[PDB]
Design a protein around this ligand. Structure first.
Ligand code: CLA
Ligand code: CLA
Ligand code: CLA
Ligand code: CLA
Ligand code: CLA
Ligand code: CLA
Ligand code: CLA
Ligand SMILES: CCCCCCCCCCCCCCCC(=O)OC[C@H](CO[C@@H]1O[C@H](CS(=O)(=O)O)[C@@H](O)[C@H](O)[C@H]1O)OC(=O)CCCCCCCCCCCCCCC
Ligand SMILES: CCCCCCCCCCCCCCCC(=O)OC[C@H](COP(=O)(O)OC[C@@H](O)CO)OC(=O)CCCCCCCCCCCCCCC
Ligand SMILES: CC1=C(/C=C/C(C)=C/C=C/C(C)=C/C=C/C=C(C)/C=C/C=C(C)/C=C/C2=C(C)C(=O)CCC2(C)C)C(C)(C)CCC1
Ligand SMILES: CC1=C(C/C=C(\C)CCC[C@H](C)CCC[C@H](C)CCCC(C)C)C(=O)c2ccccc2C1=O
Ligand code: SF4
Lengths: 165, 75, 31, 74, 80, 94, 64, 143, 41, 35
């Protein structure tokens, strides 16, 4: 109970929603024979729905007035109440992966900028170099922090074009 | 005069060397993409055979083979 | 108790007077 | 998509070019400037993109409406 | 009645004069550039404002600057 | 014009070369018969001045306002007729 | 004596109104006749008009 | 010195069938331009008003609504036919003003003896700020 | 096959193959790990 | 509502009479040549 929300393990409307979904899928079932391919497909869909609802009740999600999971996007409020996987852990995951992709692209730009024809290397991508830099970009946070402390990550303003005010 | 089949034996070689270089068909697309406008113009003038060659024969041959490719896509 | 005819007519005359004031201000602004 | 067309149909190239200049400054500050210079879409490019998105959005809206209505009732 | 001005960055390539469709610009002798010629605009009353001269100027930034101003029957390009 | 051959410009006859023509306007004194011309010029005598033809528009606008004063109701028109009960509304209103 | 930067050197543009303001350019030729903008500077980066060379004066160009 | 050529009014016109893009009401009460050129053979050219016309051997005379149409015809004669021409400004009162090849040679070639007006001796960025010319009826570039 | 591999290294071929492999990886992730609302470890 | 006749006169006045007179007056004034 972090903001007037109840856990979906004990909230009644979550179970009501699960029952309604399973009942609708059973209403879909009650038209085919037991061993037909549509019957197997609907049975798989039912199993997936029950597994999803049981997993959501297991993971400790919060449900509001009705049975819909709510996520917490405050560190501390999610850390001490055990919901860091709602926003905080995916925040760290996205920051890592986006930094990996962006650092790989950046290093490709600075690697092909000092070649004979940097114009050609951006439509005709050197695949081994791109693969190597994509691998090297997995250590993007340490490399980026090192280049920031070295001062080689940013460019001086006196070497950057601006408009004449 | 006299309707008959006339063709040219082996006009264009079959290889992948022009696949490596985009914008080969038009002279204005040469010397690389200095801007992204080059990238847009490359697709803009891909089928504009009048801007690629001045010969009606080459334009007609390109149109015929493009028709064959479209028929293959439809099939 | 709704207002009378004389009140409406007096209000309309005073609006005519302030319209004269308005056109005087407009002429002064144009000059 | 139809309302996305309204960006290209109503605006003009100079605004987007100047905004791209500011973004290019941001890229220059972090040494991530592409060698292929990013330019705003040309005026004919902008008109073509706008009309393509407009017709795509309108036709697909009508297609989804027609098919859903005629497959739900009939 | 469009203000057309020429500036000293002109290199005398005569492209602005060739681009003009109403004969506004012409080349006059000059000593500030290698080509020994600069552009001039003696007939700005015939200028429509098409800015074809600006599209032909290779100098960065351009030397033939057109300022759209008062509109007449010739600046508006009317045939009626 | 001096267009006896293919010469469609002439400074001494610049009237015809420019394109100023009558197209269909022709000069003729004879058109309307007798007495009726005097009748119509007497009907439209002093009204030809700009101020009096303005005053005709003034009395026309006076007629426009006279319709609203007494004339709209003479042709019934629903905006000045009576009313028949009323409606309450969504909730307890009026 | 020759005036301006030497031919083929690396120069920075100080004209704040130019496209390549405070950028990298190479001197192609410097005219000694008395041109108002004798320094010819070529850039790898083209402008909106598509040109990659421009003429500049003396005080709006520093080397290196 | 150079003298302008006189507009020989009795000059033959190119063969043409009659267009809708020709002269209008502006010619009678403001102005209409005219172009004169010398052709070495009978050949077909394109009218600025639409359609094809045949200019004849020798002198050819064509009047047009605007100066831009006259220069379009002159530049297509100069490119596709290598034929020079003269353009005149004709007022309805009768006065004729010589126009495009004003000093004999074309404006893209120097003549040494022209007026170099509208040529500022400063750069683009050396104009005055608009606040320093505030309430004047002039743009910063014409100071 | 140098020219063929250069064509395969061209920007559209590489971006289509890259979005294809990324989309396929994400699709198989959702196939084996469906309905992952949160990063519950 | 007191004086019911007054809208019946004023509405045509500000809908026909005053607008027609104002439009005619402004059309005359915009092409007065020598004011
Ligand atoms: C993105 C901005 C942001 C915002 C709006 C909040 C807002 C909040 N945080 Mg929080 N926090 C943030 C970033 C933020 N945080 C970050 C980046 C971290 C990681 C260092 C933390 C770590 C954190 C902890 C450990 C705690 C909070 C807590 C709180 C709540 C109580 C704060 C308080 O008592 O009064 C205001 C405090 C002032 C100093 C003013 C509050 C709603 C507390 C909580 O969980 O609530 C019960 C708690 O203990 N936060
Ligand atoms: C890997 C290349 C790369 C990198 C490192 C950056 C980095 C940056 N961009 Mg940029 N951008 C890129 C490509 C890149 N961009 C491309 C291709 C486009 C055209 C669609 C843009 C359009 C763009 C705009 C309009 C803006 C930025 C902005 C920014 C800054 C804000 C952070 C951000 O992520 O914004 C968001 C970035 C995007 C929305 C574009 C991401 C597109 C993909 C994911 C990147 C390209 C991947 C590349 C091909 C990988 C190559 C791998 C290599 C081994 C070959 C940041 C420094 C913003 C800014 O100026 O901040 C101040 C801003 O306004 N970018
Ligand atoms: C038999 C049919 C046919 C053929 C052979 C041509 C052939 C040609 N056309 Mg044309 N045209 C056609 C029909 C046809 N057209 C129709 C039906 C229209 C009305 C829309 C047009 C309107 C048109 C215009 C306005 C222009 C041409 C032009 C051209 C020439 C160059 C084409 C080019 O390379 O540009 C590039 C082609 C492309 C970049 C293909 C992409 C075009 C759009 C984006 C595809 C639409 C998206 C598609 C529906 C997928 C949507 C789903 C999406 C979410 C993935 C070329 C000779 C151009 C020209 O200059 O003529 C000389 C010119 O500008 N056409
Ligand atoms: C539905 C209509 C619509 C939409 C979606 C947008 C969207 C946008 N406008 Mg815009 N605008 C509109 C109407 C619209 N406008 C109209 C009518 C006008 C008046 C002319 C303007 C005028 C205007 C101005 C002046 C500016 C913007 C700006 C922006 C961008 C703001 C950044 C942002 O919010 O990121 C959100 C990104 C999106 C909403 C794009 C959708 C995400 C896509 C679909 C993901 C791609 C997936 C897939 C690959 C799609 C391709 C499919 C294909 C390959 C088959 C954004 C892309 C500003 C800007 O450029 O920001 C820097 C800017 O300055 N707009
Ligand atoms: C930026 C907006 C956004 C965000 C934050 C999310 C977030 C999420 N979506 Mg969603 N989605 C979005 C936009 C978004 N989506 C849009 C625009 C659409 C329409 C196309 C969809 C359609 C959609 C569907 C149909 C589904 C989701 C699902 C999910 C959840 C699955 C997480 C996962 O894939 O496991 C974790 C993934 C990884 C660990 C892989 C990360 C590493 C990869 C390999 C790197 C990739 C490199 C680039 C997740 C919480 C699924 C779900 O079940 O919801 C709960 C699902 O079924 N989304
Ligand atoms: C700006 C305020 C304002 C507005 C928007 C209206 C609007 C309206 N009035 Mg009303 N009126 C107003 C002020 C206003 N009045 C005042 C202060 C009085 C007290 C004298 C009246 C007395 C009045 C009467 C007696 C009647 C109306 C009526 C009406 C309706 C039809 C117009 C008409 O025929 O009457 C003409 C209106 C007048 C002769 C006086 C209005 C003078 C206002 C203040 C002019 C303001 C102009 C504004 C500041 C600038 C706009 C530019 C303009 C000068 C071109 C109409 C909805 C009629 C009605 O009830 O319809 C059913 C009706 O008979 N009004
Ligand atoms: C804003 C003020 C305004 C006012 C007060 C009116 C008033 C009126 N309109 Mg009108 N209208 C207006 C604006 C207005 N309109 C606008 C802006 C439009 C364009 C959208 C129209 C388009 C319109 C149409 C198409 C028609 C009307 C008609 C009418 C008349 C309704 C029928 C009737 O009463 O019988 C008859 C009306 C009268 C007898 C009064 C007029 C003549 C009187 C007697 C004075 C004539 C003087 C002369 C010397 C004799 C009515 C007088 C209908 C009509 O009757 O056509 C005229 C009708 O067909 N209106
Ligand atoms: C509310 C505002 C009302 C304003 C009304 C103003 C009207 C205009 C006015 O007074 O004009 C003043 C002028 C007098 O001018 C002058 O008339 C003078 C004579 S006298 O002064 O009137 O005696 C005369 O000498 C002089 O030349 C002449 O200029 O009067 C006229 O000449 C109007 C005559 C109109 C005759 C035709 C009317 C319409 C015919 C309808 C046909 C079909 C019928 C069905
Ligand atoms: C930081 C200290 C926070 C710990 C508070 C402990 C609260 C109870 C402990 C508790 O809630 O259970 C453990 C909790 C997450 O576990 P879950 O409750 O999600 O486990 C249940 C489900 O995941 C399985 O069905 O871990 C955390 O506390 C936050 C993780 C650390 C964040 C790592 C980021 C590092 C940077
Ligand atoms: C005597 C009388 C009669 C006549 C009565 C009349 C005739 C009454 C008329 C009433 C009217 C019709 C009043 C109209 C008033 C108009 C007003 C109050 C408008 C004010 C506008 C304002 C304040 C703003 C003006 C603005 C400014 C500031 C500018 O400078 C320019 C822009 C603009 C917006 C215009 C009759 C014979 C019947 C019966 C006998 C008695
Ligand atoms: C937004 C906008 C721009 C800016 C548009 C730009 C910079 C183009 C953006 C394209 C980006 C770089 C690629 C995005 C790729 C998408 C993921 C998918 C695009 C679809 C392709 C596959 C065709 C203009 O240049 C413009 C010009 C004239 C009138 C209106 C406008 C206008 O509205
Ligand atoms: S195009 Fe520019 S540089 Fe060339 S002559 Fe004209 S003004 Fe001078």
């Amino acid at each position: 109970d972090v903001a007037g929300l109840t856990p979906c393990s004990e909230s009644k409307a979550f179970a009501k929603r699960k029952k309604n979904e399973v009942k609708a899928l059973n209403k879909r079932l009650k038209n085919y024979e037991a061993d037909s391919a549509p019957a197997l497909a609907l049975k798989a869909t039912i199993a997936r729905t029950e597994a999803r609802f049981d997993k959501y009740a297991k993971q400790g999600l919060l449900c509001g007035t009705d049975g819909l999971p709510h996520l917490i996007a405050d560190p501390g409020l999610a850390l001490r109440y055990g919901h860091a996987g709602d926003v905080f852990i995916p925040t760290i995951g996205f920051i890592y992966f986006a930094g990996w992709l962006g650092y790989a692209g950046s290093k490709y730009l600075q690697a092909v900028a000092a070649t004979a024809k940097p114009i050609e290397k951006e439509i005709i991508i050197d695949v081994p170099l791109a693969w190597k830099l994509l691998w090297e970009g997995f250590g993007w946070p340490l490399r980026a922090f090192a280049e920031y402390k070295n001062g080689s990550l940013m460019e001086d303003d006196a070497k950057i074009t601006v408009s004449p005010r | 005069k006299k309707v008959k089949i006339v063709v040219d034996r082996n006009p264009v070689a079959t290889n992948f060397e022009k696949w490596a270089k985009p914008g080969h068909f038009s002279r204005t697309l040469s010397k690389g993409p200095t801007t992204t406008t080059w990238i847009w113009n490359l697709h803009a003038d891909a089928h504009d055979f009048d801007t690629q060659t001045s010969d009606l024969e080459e334009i007609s041959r390109k149109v015929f083979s493009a028709h064959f490719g479209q028929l293959g896509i439809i099939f | 108790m709704p207002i009378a005819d004389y009140q409406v007519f007096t209000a309309l005359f005073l609006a005519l007077a302030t319209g004269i004031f308005a056109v005087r201000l407009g002429v002064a602004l144009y000059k | 998509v139809w309302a996305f067309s309204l960006m290209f149909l109503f605006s003009g190239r100079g605004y987007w070019q100047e905004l791209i200049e500011s973004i290019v400054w941001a890229h220059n500050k972090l040494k991530v400037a592409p060698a292929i210079q990013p330019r705003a879409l040309s005026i004919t490019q902008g008109r073509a993109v706008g009309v393509a998105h407009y017709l795509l959005g309108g036709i697909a809206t009508t297609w989804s409406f027609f098919l859903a209505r005629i497959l739900a009732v009939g | 009645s469009h203000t057309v001005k020429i500036y000293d960055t002109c290199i005398g390539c005569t492209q602005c004069v060739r681009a003009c469709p109403t004969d506004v610009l012409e080349m006059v002798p000059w000593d500030g550039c290698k080509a020994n010629q600069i552009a001039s605009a003696p007939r700005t009353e015939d200028c429509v404002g098409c800015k074809r001269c600006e599209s032909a100027c290779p100098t960065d930034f351009l030397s033939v600057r057109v300022y759209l101003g008062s509109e007449t029957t010739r600046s508006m390009g009317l045939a009626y | 014009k001096y267009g006896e051959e293919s010469r469609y410009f002439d400074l001494k006859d610049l009237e015809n070369t420019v394109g100023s023509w009558d197209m269909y306007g022709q000069e003729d004194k004879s058109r309307y018969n007798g007495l009726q011309s005097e009748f119509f010029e007497r009907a439209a005598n002093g009204l030809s001045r700009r101020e009096y033809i303005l005053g005709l528009v003034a009395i026309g606008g006076a007629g426009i306002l006279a319709w609203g004063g007494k004339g709209a109701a003479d042709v019934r028109l629903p905006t000045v007729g009576p009313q028949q009960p009323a409606q309450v509304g969504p909730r307890g209103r009026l | 004596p020759d005036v301006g930067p030497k031919r083929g050197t690396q120069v920075r543009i100080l004209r704040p109104e130019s496209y390549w303001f405070r950028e990298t350019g190479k001197v192609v030729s410097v005219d000694q006749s008395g041109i108002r903008y004798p320094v010819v500077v070529r850039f790898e980066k083209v402008n909106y008009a598509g040109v990659s060379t421009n003429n500049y004066a003396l005080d709006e160009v520093v080397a290196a | 010195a150079f003298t302008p050529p006189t507009l020989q009014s009795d000059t033959p016109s190119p063969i043409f069938g009659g267009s809708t893009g020709g002269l209008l009401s502006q010619a009678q009460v403001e102005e209409f331009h005219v172009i004169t050129w010398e052709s070495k053979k009978e050949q077909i050219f394109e009218m600025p008003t639409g359609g094809a016309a045949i200019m004849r051997q020798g002198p050819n005379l064509l009047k047009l609504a605007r100066k831009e149409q006259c220069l379009a015809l002159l530049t297509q004669l100069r490119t596709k036919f290598k034929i020079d021409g003269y353009i005149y400004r004709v007022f309805p009162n009768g006065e004729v003003q010589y126009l495009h090849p004003k000093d004999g040679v074309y404006p893209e070639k120097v003549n040494a003896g022209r007026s170099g007006d509208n040529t500022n001796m400063r750069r683009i960025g050396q104009n005055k700020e608009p606040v320093q010319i505030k309430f004047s009826g002039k743009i910063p570039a014409e100071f | 096959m140098k020219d063929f591999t250069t064509y395969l290294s061209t920007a559209p071929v590489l971006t289509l193959l890259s979005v294809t492999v990324v989309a396929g990886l994400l699709i198989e992730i959702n196939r084996f790990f469906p309905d992952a609302l949160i990063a519950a470890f | 509502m007191s004086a019911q006749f007054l809208p019946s006169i004023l509405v045509p006045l500000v809908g026909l009479v005053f607008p027609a007179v104002a439009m005619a007056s402004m059309f005359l004034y915009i092409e007065k040549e020598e004011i």
